[PDB]
Design a protein around this ligand. Structure first.
Ligand SMILES: CCCCCCOCCOCCNC(=O)c1ccc(C(=O)O)c(C2=C3CC=C(N4[C@@H]5CC[C@H]4COC5)C=C3Oc3cc(N4[C@@H]5CC[C@H]4COC5)ccc32)c1
Ligand SMILES: [Ca+2]
Ligand SMILES: [Ca+2]
Ligand SMILES: [Ca+2]
Ligand SMILES: [Ca+2]
Ligand SMILES: [Cl-]
Length: 462
């Protein structure tokens, strides 16, 4: 679902105008959806239609974000508190049910603690809590977010280069697709080793092939040798000769040095060909995954090809790859599911353009940089850590009905953390949404929407 059909509404807030969705019946307790960084009310576009048939749904765009006004603010968390506090009063919301995500959940939890009699329920997912150590932060994103949290490299990355929109955001949905594509690329690379010229690749295409290259360059020295290619080719069951290995390398060895460096690998992976020969490569990769040739990639078959390509996947990681690929839910992966995994990103271009639209001007990207610099990680910043600790204490002692959504591996909320909270929060039901990183609304909106609407029917609301 890529559209945003909701009539735009605006309300005057501290001398600015804030945009919000307002759908559903007018009467009854309103359900307030709060988005986080770097999204907008667009993040709820596929959740709200499950709830709007029977409830008023209000989804603001944070100040400086979405379609809301963009004043010259520092956009600290306490800036957002001011505007969200005033937004709630401006709409005259006496009682609410909160549905909150990432920085929207800090907003909602902090507001609920201070107005506990005005909150009849809280549904939350991938929410802000104190991250005790950088060890609890996904390894693959540790370096980048540490770099985000500086005024020189972080601002150049986020503000000057729009990396948080163009890179972080499409990488914050889920993870299995990176592994499918890395191994599909390596399988197509094997084939290409065994039309006319090559494309010049974008910087985004080049990095996608960087992971695939690492599978062959076992020792990481930047070149693929006779012995490295033979190791790979060995595990796959296509066992060939040192003469075969050299001739294969020689066809791609532009500089004649006997090894394949990353630029030569790129030129092979950028070869031009008709679309139908591109399709034949993907059909051939599917047949490699589909060992018994019955038309479905089983979990056991996936384990074999992943090992034969040099991965060492836990059972949880295998299950994750299947479940992300399994559109029709039969526990296996047919050719159509394979194709989508290999050739599509988590967010369509139409979906990226909606997320991009508020931030086309670099001078408008301040909240994109300030937000990761506010994240409570390893005790910094200490005021944010203190504030979040206070509402987590409130949350542990409060009888408010709570609904927790979580995925694997998560980002803010690891599965083990979700387990802890599911047991220690009072009157809390927890729902496993399946695979996901931070944007769980882009992983399983139907379950989240369905479950929120069933949960609402049990509350003391009208
Ligand atoms: C509630 C919070 C919500 C949480 C949601 C997030 O949850 C997980 C999602 O993912 C986490 C984020 N990971 C990434 O964003 C992510 C993933 C892969 C890459 C990669 O380069 O391969 C990068 C990029 C990085 C990464 C690390 C850098 N370092 C090094 C050395 C210097 C610096 C300081 O330290 C060590 C510098 C980078 O420079 C980049 C410049 C550009 N560009 C654009 C335009 C020009 C320029 C060049 O080419 C296109 C594009 C990308 C990157 C970012
Ligand atoms: Ca090497
Ligand atoms: Ca070479
Ligand atoms: Ca099979
Ligand atoms: Ca299937
Ligand atoms: Cl953030």
């Amino acid at each position: 679902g890529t559209g945003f059909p909701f009539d735009p509404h605006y309300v005057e807030v501290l001398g600015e105008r804030m945009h919000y969705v307002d759908v559903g019946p007018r009467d009854g307790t309103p359900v307030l959806f709060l988005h986080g960084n770097p999204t907008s009310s667009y993040v709820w576009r596929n959740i709200i239609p499950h709830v709007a048939p029977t409830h008023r749904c209000i989804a603001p765009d944070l100040i400086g974000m979405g379609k809301s006004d963009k004043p010259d603010l520092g956009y600290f968390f306490d800036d957002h508190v001011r505007f969200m506090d005033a937004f709630i009063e401006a709409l005259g919301l006496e009682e609410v049910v909160l549905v909150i995500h990432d920085w929207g959940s800090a907003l909602g939890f902090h507001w609920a603690k201070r107005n506990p009699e005005r909150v009849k329920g809280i549904a939350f997912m991938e929410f802000i809590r104190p991250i005790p150590t950088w060890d609890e932060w996904p390894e693959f994103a540790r370096e980048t977010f540490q770099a985000f949290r500086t005024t020189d490299v972080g601002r150049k990355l986020i503000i000057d280069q729009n990396v948080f929109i163009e890179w972080t955001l499409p990488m914050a949905v889920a993870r299995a697709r990176r592994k499918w594509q890395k191994t599909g690329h390596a399988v197509r690379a094997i084939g290409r080793l065994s039309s006319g010229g090559s494309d010049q690749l974008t910087e985004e295409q080049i990095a996608e092939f960087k992971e695939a290259f690492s599978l062959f360059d076992k020792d990481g020295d930047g070149t693929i040798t006779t012995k490295e290619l033979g190791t790979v080719m060995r595990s796959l069951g296509q066992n060939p000769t040192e003469a075969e290995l050299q001739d294969m390398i020689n066809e791609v060895d532009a500089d004649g040095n006997g090894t394949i460096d990353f630029p030569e690998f790129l030129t092979m992976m950028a070869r031009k060909m008709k679309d139908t020969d591109s399709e034949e490569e993907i059909r051939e990769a599917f047949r490699v995954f589909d060992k018994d040739g019955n038309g479905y990639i089983s979990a056991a078959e996936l384990r074999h090809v992943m090992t034969n390509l040099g991965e060492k996947l836990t059972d949880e990681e295998v299950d994750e790859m299947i479940r992300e690929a399994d559109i029709d839910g039969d526990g296996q992966v047919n050719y159509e599911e394979f194709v989508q995994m290999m050739t599509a990103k988590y967010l369509t271009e139409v979906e990226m353009d909606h997320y991009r639209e508020p931030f086309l001007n670099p001078v408008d990207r301040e909240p994109l940089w300030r937000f990761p610099n506010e994240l409570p990680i390893a005790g910094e910043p200490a005021n944010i850590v203190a504030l979040v600790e206070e509402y987590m204490d409130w949350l542990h002692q409060s009888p408010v009905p709570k609904l927790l959504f979580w995925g694997t591996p998560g980002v803010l909320i690891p599965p083990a953390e979700a387990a802890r909270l599911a047991k220690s929060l009072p009157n809390c039901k927890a729902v496993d949404i399946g695979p996901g990183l931070n944007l769980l609304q882009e992983d399983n909106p139907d379950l989240i929407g369905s479950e929120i609407a069933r949960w609402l029917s049990t509350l003391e609301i009208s």
